[PDB]
Design a protein around this ligand. Structure first.
Ligand SMILES: *[C@@H]1O[C@H](CO)[C@@H](O[C@@H]2O[C@H](CO)[C@@H](O)[C@H](O)[C@H]2NC(C)=O)[C@H](O[C@@H]2O[C@@H](C)[C@@H](O)[C@@H](O)[C@@H]2O)[C@H]1NC(C)=O
Ligand SMILES: *[C@@H]1O[C@H](CO)[C@@H](O[C@@H]2O[C@H](CO)[C@@H](O)[C@H](O)[C@H]2NC(C)=O)[C@H](O[C@@H]2O[C@@H](C)[C@@H](O)[C@@H](O)[C@@H]2O)[C@H]1NC(C)=O
Ligand SMILES: *[C@@H]1O[C@H](CO)[C@@H](O[C@@H]2O[C@H](CO)[C@@H](O)[C@H](O)[C@H]2NC(C)=O)[C@H](O)[C@H]1NC(C)=O
Ligand SMILES: *[C@@H]1O[C@H](CO)[C@@H](O)[C@H](O)[C@H]1NC(C)=O
Ligand SMILES: OC[C@H]1O[C@H](O)[C@H](O)[C@@H](O)[C@H]1O
Ligand SMILES: OC[C@H]1O[C@H](O)[C@H](O)[C@@H](O)[C@H]1O
Length: 257
């Protein structure tokens, strides 16, 4: 009824108890992922998340409050309970605030903030601390492909040798250009028919994605899903659009060798 994993977030960095200290109040931070105990988090049936025998704890329940390690028996019960929504948030149910990495850098301190469905608020609970590398196969069994920073993504015939068809599925719920991992699949707005492009990863809601159980790739802020515009691969436009279940909105990941 408990199991232990790493927690991967912004830029593929892991949730880490700072300096490996277990003193009550020690802040959580981002740090490159490893096997050290201060990165091993045990998920207990009581909705606590523990490292080094102590609990992930909200040091306050306000926008901007720090998250720390703290003795599980002496902390406030409201401060040590966490849920893991399917879209990859880590939420404190009492406050409704979510774990956020406000900067990408090593040593960034983790805060509880208002949920804006930002990529800075995306996490993955896993023992694999490397991004998953896959092709994204969609409409007509074609492959999603990048075409440079600031340019659109679009469909092409799947090629084992096309590097721009290779995507790094990061723990922060970003979809990155595998060869250029500073770049993220980004919606150019939150409205229906806004185009999906590649932009520098900046932790934004426009860069957060969720692979749901219907084969859709969902942008949580907008609610909208990746769509091959007009079921017309020749337009070379992928947009966000409301979920319809139609073939031009169906996607599956295919792991690469
Ligand atoms: C909760 O904390 C956030 C970080 O302090 C606030 O957002 C930040 O607001 C700053 C100005 O106060 C702004 O320069 C930051 O870039 C922005 N950060 C991001 C990425 O959102 C947030 O403030 C609200 O949202 C911002 C965008 C503005 O609209 C503010 O007027 C809002 O108050 C804080 N939210 C709350 C509940 O106050
Ligand atoms: C969390 O805080 C608890 C209360 O201060 C610690 O339990 C207390 O540990 C004291 C020092 O070991 C001991 O004199 C007390 O009997 C005990 N108090 C209670 C109510 O159990 C607790 O320490 C852990 O649990 C106790 C029972 C022993 O097994 C300790 O050696 C454990 O470390 C603190 N937990 C942690 C992880 O620090
Ligand atoms: C995706 O990109 C990664 C990162 O560049 C590639 O992984 C590197 O591969 C080289 C050659 O095998 C290794 O020596 C490095 O250790 C890898 N780096 C990291 C950080 O993992 C990878 O080959 C690319 N393609 C695929 C299919 O994963
Ligand atoms: C698909 O898009 C291409 C490129 O713009 C266009 O020439 C073609 O007529 C479109 N096909 C349909 C059925 O609209
Ligand atoms: O705080 C920086 C760094 O300190 C040590 O190197 C720890 O082992 C890491 O896990 C990390 O916490
Ligand atoms: O115009 C955009 C819209 O075009 C058609 O209606 C498609 O079926 C939708 O999925 C969407 O692509």
């Amino acid at each position: 009824t408990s199991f232990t994993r790493n927690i991967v977030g912004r830029d593929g960095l892991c949730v880490d108890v700072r300096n490996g200290y277990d003193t009550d109040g020690t802040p959580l931070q981002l740090w490159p992922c490893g096997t050290q105990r201060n990165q091993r988090w045990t998920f207990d049936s009581d909705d606590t998340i523990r490292s080094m025998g102590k609990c992930m704890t909200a040091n306050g329940l306000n926008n901007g409050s720090n998250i720390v390690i703290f003795n599980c028996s002496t902390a406030a019960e409201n401060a040590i309970k966490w849920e893991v929504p399917i879209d990859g948030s880590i939420i404190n149910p009492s406050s409704g605030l979510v774990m956020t990495a406000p900067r990408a850098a090593s040593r960034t301190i983790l805060l509880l903030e208002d949920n804006i469905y930002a990529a800075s608020q995306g996490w993955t609970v896993t023992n694999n601390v490397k991004p998953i590398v896959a092709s994204i196969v969609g409409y007509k069994e074609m492959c999603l492909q990048s075409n440079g920073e600031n340019n659109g993504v679009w469909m092409e015939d799947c090629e084992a040798t096309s590097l721009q068809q290779q995507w790094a599925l990061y723990g922060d719920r970003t979809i990155r250009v595998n060869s250029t991992r500073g770049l993220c699949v980004t919606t150019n707005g939150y409205n229906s028919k806004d185009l999906i492009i590649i932009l520098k990863c900046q932790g934004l809601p426009s860069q957060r994605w969720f692979f749901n159980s219907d084969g859709a790739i969902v942008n949580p802020k907008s609610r909208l899903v990746m769509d091959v515009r007009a079921s017309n691969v020749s337009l070379r436009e992928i947009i966000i659009f409301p979920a319809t279940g139609n073939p031009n909105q169906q996607w599956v990941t295919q792991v690469l060798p």
